[PDB]
Amino acid sequence: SSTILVIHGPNLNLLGKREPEVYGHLTLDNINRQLIAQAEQASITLDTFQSNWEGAIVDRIHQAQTEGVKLIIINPAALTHTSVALRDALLGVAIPFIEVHLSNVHAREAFRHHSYLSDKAIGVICGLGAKGYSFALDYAIEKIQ
Amino acid sequence: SSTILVIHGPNLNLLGKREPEVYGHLTLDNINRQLIAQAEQASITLDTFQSNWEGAIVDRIHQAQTEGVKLIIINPAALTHTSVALRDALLGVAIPFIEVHLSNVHAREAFRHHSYLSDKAIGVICGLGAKGYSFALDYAIEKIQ
Amino acid sequence: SSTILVIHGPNLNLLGKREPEVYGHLTLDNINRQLIAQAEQASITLDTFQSNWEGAIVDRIHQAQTEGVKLIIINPAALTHTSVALRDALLGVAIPFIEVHLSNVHAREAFRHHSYLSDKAIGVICGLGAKGYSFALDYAIEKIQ
Amino acid sequence: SSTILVIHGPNLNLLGKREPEVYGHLTLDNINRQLIAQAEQASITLDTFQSNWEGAIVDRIHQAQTEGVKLIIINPAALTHTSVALRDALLGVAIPFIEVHLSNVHAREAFRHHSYLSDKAIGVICGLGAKGYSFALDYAIEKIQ
Amino acid sequence: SSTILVIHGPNLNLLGKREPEVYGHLTLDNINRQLIAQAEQASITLDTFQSNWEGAIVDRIHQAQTEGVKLIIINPAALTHTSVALRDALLGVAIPFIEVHLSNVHAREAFRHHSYLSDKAIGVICGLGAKGYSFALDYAIEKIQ
Amino acid sequence: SSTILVIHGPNLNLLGKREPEVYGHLTLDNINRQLIAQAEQASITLDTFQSNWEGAIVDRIHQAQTEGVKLIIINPAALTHTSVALRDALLGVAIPFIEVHLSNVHAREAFRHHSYLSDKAIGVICGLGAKGYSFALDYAIEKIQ
Amino acid sequence: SSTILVIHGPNLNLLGKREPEVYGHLTLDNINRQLIAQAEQASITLDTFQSNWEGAIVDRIHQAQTEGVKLIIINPAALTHTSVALRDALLGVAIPFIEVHLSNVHAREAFRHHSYLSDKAIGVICGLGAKGYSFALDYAIEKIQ
Amino acid sequence: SSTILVIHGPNLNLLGKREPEVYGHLTLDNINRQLIAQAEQASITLDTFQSNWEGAIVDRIHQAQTEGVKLIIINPAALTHTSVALRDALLGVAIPFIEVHLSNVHAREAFRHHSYLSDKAIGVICGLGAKGYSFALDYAIEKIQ
Amino acid sequence: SSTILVIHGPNLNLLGKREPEVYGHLTLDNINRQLIAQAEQASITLDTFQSNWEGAIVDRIHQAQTEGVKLIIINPAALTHTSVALRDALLGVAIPFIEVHLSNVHAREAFRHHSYLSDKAIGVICGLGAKGYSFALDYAIEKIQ
Amino acid sequence: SSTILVIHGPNLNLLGKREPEVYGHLTLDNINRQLIAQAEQASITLDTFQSNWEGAIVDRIHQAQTEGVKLIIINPAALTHTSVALRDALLGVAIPFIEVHLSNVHAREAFRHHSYLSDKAIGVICGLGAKGYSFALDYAIEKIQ
Amino acid sequence: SSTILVIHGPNLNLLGKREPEVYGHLTLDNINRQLIAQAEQASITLDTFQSNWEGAIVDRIHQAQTEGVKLIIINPAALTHTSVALRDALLGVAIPFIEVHLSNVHAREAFRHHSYLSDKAIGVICGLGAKGYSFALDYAIEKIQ
Amino acid sequence: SSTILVIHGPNLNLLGKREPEVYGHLTLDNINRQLIAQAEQASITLDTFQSNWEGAIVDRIHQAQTEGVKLIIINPAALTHTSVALRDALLGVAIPFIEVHLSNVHAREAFRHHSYLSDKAIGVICGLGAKGYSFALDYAIEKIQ
């Protein structure tokens, strides 16, 4: 076993609401099951977390260090542009991470072009929807096994 | 759907705590009671919330979607200049909102000129004190009818 | 002889001379009568003024000081971003004012963010249409007491 | 009755107030006659206006809507860089316009690169002297035939 | 008929209006008389102008060229920061000018540091009150015989 | 291969390759043929060139000097914002030029505002489609004499 | 059926030219064979191209429109920061594309933070090495059915 | 009796991670003990708090005002650069505070140079490790007595 | 002792050294002599000082406080844009000062638009040559007497 | 000889001049004596230096290298924002240093936030008055041990 | 033994085409012969290259490496301010290089101040005309004994 | 007669500290001697000067004019980024100069990119060590004859 932790930032729980025509058929829950199954197939243990509170996410990352997590896949969402605390949490624990965004962040408002995490991440994926998570997982698996 | 939610941001709980003026007497509770009474008088049901925690406010606005809420009157206070998460929360639930500030924010420090919420709000009131909330409420009432 | 003065900036005379799509029928005169009536109900005298010339507005403000105007409600419109002469006029006469905008300025072009008047106004209302003027008057009446 | 309106901004009246020093012999009046003639040859009415007061120009644009002007050719001169009130006047009346400059603005002081009207114009011509006005007219005529 | 022209910008007319010690007791009119007397003592004709309208000032400068004015002393006041039209008027007539301010402009708001006239003035005086005008006149008289 | 040369920058070949509104009927060749005809009518020879490669365009400008080209009309397209080598090419040969753009550059992305060739051109035309090329030529023909 | 084109920018050819110390030993060709195979396994045609010349890449992109290419995977490399011509080419043809980089660009110099392409891509992958191209293809494949 | 409160920021709980030098053996607990002893020796009551949640820290500060704390020694850590809410909390309660950083913040990333607290603190110490807290304490004691 | 102190900054000693039509014939000593005479005529003592060393100037200003200097007229020359130490010296002693420049600083390099002293000076005079010093003295005399 | 060198920058000599109101009765001499005594008590030798001339301080730093100074405590005062030479002097000799300021610099002018020294210092203290020097010394002593 | 490669950028070939002074007489060939002769004397092989095409220069740099070039002297000319691709080529091959410019670039237009190659060059020479090339070679010879 | 002056700025005297790693075994005197000899070989008189005091350098430059120096080779070191006085000294005496730096400035901190001298120098050499001085001298010698 070699645990991988997936973290979802604020507002991701909004999943899929008013489904036709607001780019949300699938729900976070759907994304998590898919990921757990994908990890399940490669004999790797995988946990997922989400919260709208920054502190909750930071506490989770610390817990991850004590639990021997080898790699974090994180979609910080809004936090990417605002939280240095989150960056320090990932740096302080020294667990390698991949940053994931569903939507293309560079196609949005200018303040969305700045990240406190990207420069320290192994790699980033943006705009490929939920597949982005899958791709990150696939990479993370090769990296360990 | 004909319920109105008022949200107060961080540090608003400190209103009225230092005895007399500058800006004494008046409390957050005082403001809440006036607003509830105003909403009753027009036979509308008004709910309030205050928290110093960003996540708590974000969760509340999620709850607001599930409940009846038609319009949100929010004084994000400090969060206005820092929180894109709050902005995505309001945007993600698609509930229309009015931004209120007690003091003239343009009159203070330059960093206070910038807002992550103003461009998406229906309107903004700043500098009129507690009346600002009342004015936002009056408009909100004439928007449902 | 007039206790309250309302000032409308350039291009406001065009209200209601557009469409049935792009704006309805509300005109600047309609707004003025509404305000005059509101003031009369509270036994306060109200005077109004509009011009597309900056110098006419500056002269009006000077005249206001000789006439004992107690408060000024102003929608500078475009002038808000450009005229420091208007700011120095309001400052020079020392008459307190409230700034009003029909549309949400923060909503539009980046250059619309800056104002030469906001930091010196008692308060500002933007994005609530004509009601903003009423909200400002209501506040000014309370204050006139 | 005036089908196409030509507006000259501030200081344009000074044209030809000297030998071949700042410019050559040509005057604003010369430019106007050439333009009227060019319009007459194509069976199109053409009116002209110049002022050193921003408010006079703003008033003229408003008058232009009531009469039924279909296109405006404007050399704002100095105002291009300063007046958003002029921009709002052109936008509020919804009359398409072409911006013309006699001299190359991009070859002078850095501030002269900024314009409150170019992004909203159909096209712009600068640096081609009086001919620029002629080219704009030729384009305006084909647009309207 | 007048060798030197003195121009006062917007809001200068207000000098000495809030008499008991806000601005002090000195009026524009007083400054003008002192200036007229000083020029008379040197056998030089002096004329003065003030307006709150930018276009009136621009028209006056033009008139100055036809009247053979040799030097202009101007206190543009607020316009110094906003009007390129004024700058172009002074440049277009090619009359040398000295810029004067009653208060120390570098003392106040950052926006007041920027001037559309200074780089083209012969010289600038700020923060010396009315004397500044007197000093400029003294210099102008020596420059001319 | 003398007299007047017209240069088209990268992506200009695609003109009219799209039949539908995100283009139109007109193609680059069409424009070229109209311009050659317009020049022939005035007894002036006119050559044309397009390339997607910056070096090819630079080489051609050099060639133009040897060939005794008197004026260049250029639409650098994307190169306007990025190529100082093109600016130096035009400057190095010392052949006066007119810059032309089909679309209104000022109405698009902020990065488009900047140009490495506008401040050195005689003049610039943007936003008037193909007619812009024709106006520049017409100007170039009157200048030769 | 529909085709997939992969484009590599300048310097990519160098992959595998100073092999040690386990950083750069896989070659561009290796990557190309893996991608082809990946495509053939899903029965999609795939073509590849590399050049150090911007104009060559731009010509290929045009060529791609004629050939009915449905999607493009591109690693613009250095070009990503300098070439608006490349952006315009992809935009002009209207072929959707995915941006890929072998290294995390955000972890290097600041100037590498800026991209002329990213805002318009469907998505971007940076910092996952060669797997980034493969992930882009799998997404592309699923896109075409 | 007399209370001094020491607030530790997010990620501070991680002190003491890989023990023989990434950082040292020293823990937050250790620091807390030294400080408490130091205060006891001077007959001053000292409380400590740490949290990874910004709201938690904000309430604690609110609690401090009710509790009669006379001075706060805070290490905001990451929040220093991001939380105006924290600044307002300290300002709202009106308790004087000293800012402490273990590491020289000006020796790291540019984004760390900026602080929302420093300008309002009595003083600041950075880069002296745990001693920084002690010095702050020592200063605090002399200040109340 | 000395009532008024005049300080000249670096390179002022060069005045009148490139004797032909550069500078003029006027030297720093000549200016000093004129100023000393002007002061004697008004029964005021005046001292002067020049140095190319910043520390020497700073020391001189300190000495000035011990000597009871009422007002300082200073031409910092090149320092005005670089020396905060000089600013702090003038501020620390609390002696009011007038800033003077022989040439129009706004007519030169952009970096010369910035001053570490101007916002704190009573007033500034630039571009009037040596007379600037005399004007500053005249104002100083009236301020004292 | 374990030596520590304390450097004081320009304007520090002024301490304790304006005796009763603005700042207190403490002088530079007092501070130096308290520091020497502090060092003597720990059996460390301590020299001190002050100058208003940048070069003198630079020379002093060079001498220190020769004298085997092990650490430097510096208050550069105004030179912190302007002197790269001071920075290079400290770096060139490779003697570690601590930066000290008596007042809170971040609380003063925006230009005072910038330092040429901070990023290279071991640590920095500001706003704690003279104690700040004592704290730095205490730290230095423990460091040399 | 091995070789030194001299690379010349766009527009260099134009050297020597206006007499006598727009930097007349000297041609790119003259310079090349001078450099070849200088190398020969020192028994070092030297090749040269010039192109107006970026890709040609990039290709040559790749080709330089396969042929064991030890040092490159390059005058990128205009490319210095735009070409990251050129930067990556030199970096990818890992061949040290010296940057040369005939004219003083820092004099030139501000954009001309920036370089994508200066920070990575061994050294840079600018403003010394053709000698600059000779100096670099001289340096290159001693370096490559 | 003819003399070339070489000037060295602050911290240059330290050349020769730590012979194996930081620095090299060459000393300022070493260089000086090499330059004097080089000048002798060419029958030119050469003087040198170094100081850590800006004023000293400025005074030397003044002295140089009186002495008929014809060209100055200066390494201003840290002063290049901070001293406008140094620039005005070189400009005021009107002696042409070459700027030299031992290390590549462009390879260090961003603030080191800016120079107050570079635009006014004949040329600049950087990053070539001591040789840079020699190259400047060689050029200076041909320039004289």
Side-chain angles (χ1 to χ4, degrees), chain H residues 107-121:
Chain H
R108 318 179 55 195
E109 314 90 356
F111 77 80
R112 302 198 172 271
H113 299 10
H114 166 52
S115 188
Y116 276 122
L117 271 58
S118 291
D119 55 314
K120 292 302 176 165

PDB file of all heavy atoms in Angstrom, chain H residues 107-121:
ATOM      1  N   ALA H 107      14.254  37.667   3.192  1.00  0.00           N
ATOM      2  CA  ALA H 107      15.239  36.840   2.482  1.00  0.00           C
ATOM      3  C   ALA H 107      14.635  35.774   1.575  1.00  0.00           C
ATOM      4  O   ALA H 107      15.323  35.047   0.973  1.00  0.00           O
ATOM      5  CB  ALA H 107      16.155  36.211   3.493  1.00  0.00           C
ATOM      6  N   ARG H 108      13.316  35.748   1.477  1.00  0.00           N
ATOM      7  CA  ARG H 108      12.582  34.708   0.770  1.00  0.00           C
ATOM      8  C   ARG H 108      11.851  35.335  -0.412  1.00  0.00           C
ATOM      9  O   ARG H 108      12.313  36.361  -0.939  1.00  0.00           O
ATOM     10  CB  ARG H 108      11.648  33.987   1.786  1.00  0.00           C
ATOM     11  CG  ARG H 108      12.292  33.706   3.126  1.00  0.00           C
ATOM     12  CD  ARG H 108      11.427  33.035   4.166  1.00  0.00           C
ATOM     13  NE  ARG H 108      10.824  31.795   3.716  1.00  0.00           N
ATOM     14  CZ  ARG H 108       9.809  31.204   4.368  1.00  0.00           C
ATOM     15  NH1 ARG H 108       9.278  31.750   5.475  1.00  0.00           N
ATOM     16  NH2 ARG H 108       9.283  30.075   3.872  1.00  0.00           N
ATOM     17  N   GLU H 109      10.704  34.772  -0.767  1.00  0.00           N
ATOM     18  CA  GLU H 109       9.929  35.268  -1.906  1.00  0.00           C
ATOM     19  C   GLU H 109       9.364  36.703  -1.790  1.00  0.00           C
ATOM     20  O   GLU H 109       8.925  37.116  -0.763  1.00  0.00           O
ATOM     21  CB  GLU H 109       8.800  34.318  -2.212  1.00  0.00           C
ATOM     22  CG  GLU H 109       9.231  32.887  -2.235  1.00  0.00           C
ATOM     23  CD  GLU H 109       9.088  32.298  -0.814  1.00  0.00           C
ATOM     24  OE1 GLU H 109       8.754  32.944   0.142  1.00  0.00           O
ATOM     25  OE2 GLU H 109       9.263  31.072  -0.714  1.00  0.00           O
ATOM     26  N   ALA H 110       9.282  37.388  -2.902  1.00  0.00           N
ATOM     27  CA  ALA H 110       8.883  38.773  -2.871  1.00  0.00           C
ATOM     28  C   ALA H 110       7.548  38.985  -2.214  1.00  0.00           C
ATOM     29  O   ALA H 110       7.283  39.989  -1.582  1.00  0.00           O
ATOM     30  CB  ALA H 110       8.854  39.315  -4.289  1.00  0.00           C
ATOM     31  N   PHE H 111       6.682  38.028  -2.360  1.00  0.00           N
ATOM     32  CA  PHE H 111       5.310  38.121  -1.811  1.00  0.00           C
ATOM     33  C   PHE H 111       5.307  38.103  -0.302  1.00  0.00           C
ATOM     34  O   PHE H 111       4.362  38.597   0.305  1.00  0.00           O
ATOM     35  CB  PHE H 111       4.317  37.088  -2.375  1.00  0.00           C
ATOM     36  CG  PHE H 111       4.474  35.711  -1.808  1.00  0.00           C
ATOM     37  CD1 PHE H 111       3.968  35.393  -0.598  1.00  0.00           C
ATOM     38  CD2 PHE H 111       5.120  34.692  -2.557  1.00  0.00           C
ATOM     39  CE1 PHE H 111       4.079  34.092  -0.128  1.00  0.00           C
ATOM     40  CE2 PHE H 111       5.264  33.438  -2.042  1.00  0.00           C
ATOM     41  CZ  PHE H 111       4.759  33.129  -0.848  1.00  0.00           C
ATOM     42  N   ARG H 112       6.421  37.688   0.271  1.00  0.00           N
ATOM     43  CA  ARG H 112       6.566  37.688   1.719  1.00  0.00           C
ATOM     44  C   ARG H 112       7.010  39.017   2.312  1.00  0.00           C
ATOM     45  O   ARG H 112       6.991  39.173   3.484  1.00  0.00           O
ATOM     46  CB  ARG H 112       7.528  36.594   2.116  1.00  0.00           C
ATOM     47  CG  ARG H 112       7.091  35.218   1.652  1.00  0.00           C
ATOM     48  CD  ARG H 112       7.781  34.146   2.383  1.00  0.00           C
ATOM     49  NE  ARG H 112       7.275  32.859   2.122  1.00  0.00           N
ATOM     50  CZ  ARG H 112       6.285  32.289   2.807  1.00  0.00           C
ATOM     51  NH1 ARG H 112       5.656  32.951   3.760  1.00  0.00           N
ATOM     52  NH2 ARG H 112       5.893  31.054   2.432  1.00  0.00           N
ATOM     53  N   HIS H 113       7.436  39.966   1.479  1.00  0.00           N
ATOM     54  CA  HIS H 113       7.795  41.283   1.957  1.00  0.00           C
ATOM     55  C   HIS H 113       6.629  42.091   2.453  1.00  0.00           C
ATOM     56  O   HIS H 113       6.780  43.007   3.200  1.00  0.00           O
ATOM     57  CB  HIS H 113       8.545  42.010   0.850  1.00  0.00           C
ATOM     58  CG  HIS H 113       9.809  41.308   0.441  1.00  0.00           C
ATOM     59  ND1 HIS H 113      10.098  40.037   0.889  1.00  0.00           N
ATOM     60  CD2 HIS H 113      10.931  41.758  -0.184  1.00  0.00           C
ATOM     61  CE1 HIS H 113      11.299  39.695   0.480  1.00  0.00           C
ATOM     62  NE2 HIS H 113      11.830  40.726  -0.162  1.00  0.00           N
ATOM     63  N   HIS H 114       5.446  41.749   2.007  1.00  0.00           N
ATOM     64  CA  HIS H 114       4.247  42.524   2.298  1.00  0.00           C
ATOM     65  C   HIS H 114       3.520  41.992   3.495  1.00  0.00           C
ATOM     66  O   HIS H 114       3.344  40.798   3.608  1.00  0.00           O
ATOM     67  CB  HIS H 114       3.311  42.495   1.115  1.00  0.00           C
ATOM     68  CG  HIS H 114       1.935  42.967   1.441  1.00  0.00           C
ATOM     69  ND1 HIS H 114       1.683  44.177   2.066  1.00  0.00           N
ATOM     70  CD2 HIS H 114       0.727  42.420   1.170  1.00  0.00           C
ATOM     71  CE1 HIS H 114       0.393  44.356   2.176  1.00  0.00           C
ATOM     72  NE2 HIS H 114      -0.197  43.328   1.591  1.00  0.00           N
ATOM     73  N   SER H 115       3.084  42.927   4.324  1.00  0.00           N
ATOM     74  CA  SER H 115       2.363  42.581   5.510  1.00  0.00           C
ATOM     75  C   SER H 115       1.148  43.453   5.779  1.00  0.00           C
ATOM     76  O   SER H 115       1.215  44.649   5.708  1.00  0.00           O
ATOM     77  CB  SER H 115       3.311  42.640   6.711  1.00  0.00           C
ATOM     78  OG  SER H 115       2.697  42.145   7.863  1.00  0.00           O
ATOM     79  N   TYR H 116       0.064  42.826   6.200  1.00  0.00           N
ATOM     80  CA  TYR H 116      -1.137  43.566   6.584  1.00  0.00           C
ATOM     81  C   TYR H 116      -1.140  43.952   8.038  1.00  0.00           C
ATOM     82  O   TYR H 116      -2.041  44.612   8.463  1.00  0.00           O
ATOM     83  CB  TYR H 116      -2.360  42.746   6.323  1.00  0.00           C
ATOM     84  CG  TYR H 116      -2.833  42.854   4.902  1.00  0.00           C
ATOM     85  CD1 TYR H 116      -2.953  41.752   4.140  1.00  0.00           C
ATOM     86  CD2 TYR H 116      -3.191  44.035   4.341  1.00  0.00           C
ATOM     87  CE1 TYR H 116      -3.390  41.816   2.851  1.00  0.00           C
ATOM     88  CE2 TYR H 116      -3.655  44.122   3.067  1.00  0.00           C
ATOM     89  CZ  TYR H 116      -3.750  42.998   2.328  1.00  0.00           C
ATOM     90  OH  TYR H 116      -4.049  43.012   0.980  1.00  0.00           O
ATOM     91  N   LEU H 117      -0.131  43.549   8.788  1.00  0.00           N
ATOM     92  CA  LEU H 117      -0.035  43.885  10.195  1.00  0.00           C
ATOM     93  C   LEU H 117       1.091  44.831  10.599  1.00  0.00           C
ATOM     94  O   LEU H 117       0.948  45.564  11.502  1.00  0.00           O
ATOM     95  CB  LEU H 117       0.151  42.615  10.960  1.00  0.00           C
ATOM     96  CG  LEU H 117      -1.065  41.852  11.448  1.00  0.00           C
ATOM     97  CD1 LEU H 117      -1.971  41.483  10.278  1.00  0.00           C
ATOM     98  CD2 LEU H 117      -0.614  40.556  12.141  1.00  0.00           C
ATOM     99  N   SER H 118       2.198  44.770   9.899  1.00  0.00           N
ATOM    100  CA  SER H 118       3.404  45.453  10.348  1.00  0.00           C
ATOM    101  C   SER H 118       3.275  46.916  10.594  1.00  0.00           C
ATOM    102  O   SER H 118       3.855  47.455  11.528  1.00  0.00           O
ATOM    103  CB  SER H 118       4.515  45.296   9.340  1.00  0.00           C
ATOM    104  OG  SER H 118       4.978  43.995   9.277  1.00  0.00           O
ATOM    105  N   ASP H 119       2.525  47.599   9.763  1.00  0.00           N
ATOM    106  CA  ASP H 119       2.420  49.024   9.925  1.00  0.00           C
ATOM    107  C   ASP H 119       1.659  49.441  11.154  1.00  0.00           C
ATOM    108  O   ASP H 119       1.803  50.580  11.595  1.00  0.00           O
ATOM    109  CB  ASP H 119       1.823  49.661   8.720  1.00  0.00           C
ATOM    110  CG  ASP H 119       0.508  49.071   8.369  1.00  0.00           C
ATOM    111  OD1 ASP H 119       0.402  47.821   8.367  1.00  0.00           O
ATOM    112  OD2 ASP H 119      -0.437  49.850   8.027  1.00  0.00           O
ATOM    113  N   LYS H 120       0.879  48.516  11.683  1.00  0.00           N
ATOM    114  CA  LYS H 120       0.117  48.769  12.884  1.00  0.00           C
ATOM    115  C   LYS H 120       0.694  48.194  14.180  1.00  0.00           C
ATOM    116  O   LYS H 120       0.251  48.525  15.267  1.00  0.00           O
ATOM    117  CB  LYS H 120      -1.299  48.297  12.719  1.00  0.00           C
ATOM    118  CG  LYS H 120      -2.067  49.113  11.723  1.00  0.00           C
ATOM    119  CD  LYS H 120      -2.070  50.528  12.123  1.00  0.00           C
ATOM    120  CE  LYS H 120      -2.780  51.388  11.043  1.00  0.00           C
ATOM    121  NZ  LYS H 120      -3.113  52.758  11.572  1.00  0.00           N
ATOM    122  N   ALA H 121       1.663  47.310  14.067  1.00  0.00           N
ATOM    123  CA  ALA H 121       2.373  46.781  15.221  1.00  0.00           C
ATOM    124  C   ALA H 121       3.257  47.852  15.890  1.00  0.00           C
ATOM    125  O   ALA H 121       3.672  48.826  15.315  1.00  0.00           O
ATOM    126  CB  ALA H 121       3.283  45.619  14.799  1.00  0.00           C
TER     127      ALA H 121
END
